[PDB]
Amino acid sequence: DHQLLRYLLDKD
Amino acid sequence: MELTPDQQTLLHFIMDSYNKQRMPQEITNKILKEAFSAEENFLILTEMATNHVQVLVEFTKKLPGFQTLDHEDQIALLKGSAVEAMFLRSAEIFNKKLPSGHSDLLEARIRNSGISDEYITPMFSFYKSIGELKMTQEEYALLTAIVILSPDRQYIKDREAVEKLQEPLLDVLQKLCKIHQPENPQHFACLLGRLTELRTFNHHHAEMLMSWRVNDHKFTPLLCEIWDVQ
Numbered sequence: 485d486h487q488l489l490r491y492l493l494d495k496d
Numbered sequence: 497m498e499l500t501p502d503q504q505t506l507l508h509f510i511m512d513s514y515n516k517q518r519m520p521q522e523i524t525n526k527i528l529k530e531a532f533s534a535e536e537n538f539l540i541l542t543e544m545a546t547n548h549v550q551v552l553v554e555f556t557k558k559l560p561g562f563q564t565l566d567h568e569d570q571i572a573l574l575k576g577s578a579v580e581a582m583f584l585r586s587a588e589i590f591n592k593k594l595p596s597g598h599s600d601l602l603e604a605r606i607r608n609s610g611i612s613d614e615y616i617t618p619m620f621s622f623y624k625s626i627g628e629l630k631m632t633q634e635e636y637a638l639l640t641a642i643v644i645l646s647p648d649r650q651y652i653k654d655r656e657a658v659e660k661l662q663e664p665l666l667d668v669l670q671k672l673c674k675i676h677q678p679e680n681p682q683h684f685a686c687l688l689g690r691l692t693e694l695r696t697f698n699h700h701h702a703e704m705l706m707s708w709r710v711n712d713h714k715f716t717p718l719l720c721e722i723w724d725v726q
C-alpha cells in the first residue's frame with residue numbers, strides 16, 4: 485500500500 | 497529551431513518548480529566540513545532522501561496535466577521514478593563546480609560513506625558520465641520531468657495520456673540541446689541514453705541501502721513506501 489504517497493498526491 | 501513563446505513559458509515554469517529543492521551548497525558543505533561514521537552518513541541519507549521524496553511529489557504535481565491523469569497512474573509514475581530522480585539530483589550536485597581539491601574530497605567522502613564497493617563503481621561511472629555532458633540547470637529540470645512522465649512504467653494503464661504530457665518536454669529539451677551545444681549534434685541522444693543507464697539503479701536500489709555498513713537500517717515510513725525496504 486502507498487497511503488502516504490496517495491495522501492501527499494491528494495492533499496491541497 | 498528557436499523556442500516558441502509557449503515553450504519559453506513551459507521552460508520557465510519547470511525551472512521555477514525545480515528550484516524549490518535544497519541548495520547543492522547546503523548538501524556538499526555538510527559532507528566536506530567533517531568526516532562522519534557510516535552510521536551518521538546513513539542517517540544523513542535517510543533524512544535527505546525523505547525530504548527529496550516530498551520535494552519530488554510537489555514538483556510532479558506542478559507538471560502540466562499531471563493532476564488530470566488517473567489516480568492509480570499518478571502513484572505508478574511517482575513510485576517508478578523516485579529513485580532515478582534522487583540519483584539524477586545526486587549526479588547534478590556531484591558535478592557542481594567547487595574550489596580546487598573540494599570535488600576530490602567530496603568523492604572520497606562518498607566512497608567512504610558506508611555504501612558497499614560493488615555499488616560505488618556503477619554510481620561514480622554514472623555521475624562522471626553525467627558530468628561529461630556539461631548539463632545546464634534547465635537540462636536537469638527537463639530531464640527530471642521526462643524521467644517522471646515515462647509512459648513505459650510498470651502498472652501504467654493509460655500510456656497514451658502519459659506520452660502526451662511527456663512529448664512537449666522532449667520537444668523543448670531537443671531545442672535547448674540544439675541551442676546550448678550546436679557543435680555536438682549527439683547531445684540530445686546522449687542525454688536520453690543516460691536515462692537508460694539511470695534505470696539500472698532501480699534493480700539494486702534496495703540492496704544498495706541494505707548493504708550499507710551499519711548494524712541497523714532504520715528508514716522513515718515515507719521511504720518504506722517509495723523504496724523497496726522494510
Ligand SMILES: O=C(N[C@H]1CC[C@H](OS(=O)(=O)O)CC1)[C@H](C1CCCCC1)n1c(-c2ccc(Cl)cc2)nc2cc(F)c(F)cc21
Nearest residue numbers: 517518523524537540541544548585586589590606609704
Ligand atoms: O544525500 C544524498 N543525496 C541527496 C539526493 C537528494 C538531494 O535533495 S534535494 O533537496 O537537492 O532535491 C539531497 C542529496 C547522498 C549522500 C548521503 C550521505 C552520505 C553520502 C551520500 N548522495 C548520493 C547517494 C549515494 C548513495 C545512495 Cl543509495 C543515494 C544517494 N550521491 C551523492 C552525490 C553528491 F554529490 C552528494 F552531494 C550527495 C550524494
